[PDB]
């Protein structure tokens, strides 16, 4: 059976941090559901790219569980994820079932808001570090991608391919990740 990913898309999401993981995971044969936090209507991203979700989060929640739940960043997008009781319930269920949660740039601040993965080693964008580290609920990392068990974090648009390929490796293994990486023309 193909692995499955849920990507939660909120208004103000960083569109690169959304699209790069969706595209890379789909290249790996993962069945990705781009789920709109606000419903199936189009979502205006941080730099005004408008993405049409595959489903509402309400409907996508019904079709779990998922092998990974992915939280893009964006200042407003991560704020919206952080304020959502629906996101809180999905992340708590994913943590409880020992499923992977992956968040990039400002996205990890939604882990803090929902009390997910406390005591984990995490990274964030530098500009989100102080927010993430308020209260000392995590240990901080400067690694471009940090994987501490089932909590996978990363730093920014420029780490999005590394982040996505780490998700692919976690779900589908090293060889699939190498296959997907091969034609991307990534540096090293
Ligand atoms: C990646 N998706 N990024 C990196 C730059 C963008 C971002 O994180 N911008 C931020 N603006 C604020 C953040 S993060 C956190 N912040 C505070 O530290 C306020 N007090 N806090 N505990 C507010 C503004 C998106």
Author numbering: 2 to 189
Provide the publication's sentences verbatim:
It is a small multifunctional protein (20 kDa) containing 189 amino acids, which participates in transcriptional regulation and mitochondrial regulation, and acts as a molecular chaperone, oxidative stress sensor, and glyoxalase. The upregulation of PARK7 is involved with various types of cancer, and the high serum level of PARK7 is positively correlated with tumorigenesis, metastasis, and prognosis. Therefore, finding compounds specifically binding to active site Cys106 that can serve as tools to differentiate scaffolding and enzymatic function of PARK7 contributing to disease pathogenesis or as therapeutic drugs is currently emerging.
We recently reported a small-molecule cyanimide inhibitor (8RK64) and activity-based probe (8RK59) for the deubiquitinase (DUB) UCHL1 and showed PARK7 to be the major off-target. Globally, the inhibitor fits into a groove between two α-helices formed by residues 76–84 and 126–134. The covalent bond between 8RK64 and PARK7 is clearly visible. The cyanimide moiety of the inhibitor reacted to active site Cys106, thereby forming an isothiourea linkage, which is similar to what has been observed for the reaction of cyanamide-based and azanitrile inhibitors with cathepsins. The isothiourea moiety is stabilized by an H-bond between the NH and the carboxylate side chain of the nearby Glu18. From the structure, we observed an unoccupied space in the area surrounding the azide moiety of 8RK64. We reasoned that the structure of 8RK64 could serve as a starting point for developing more selective inhibitors for PARK7.
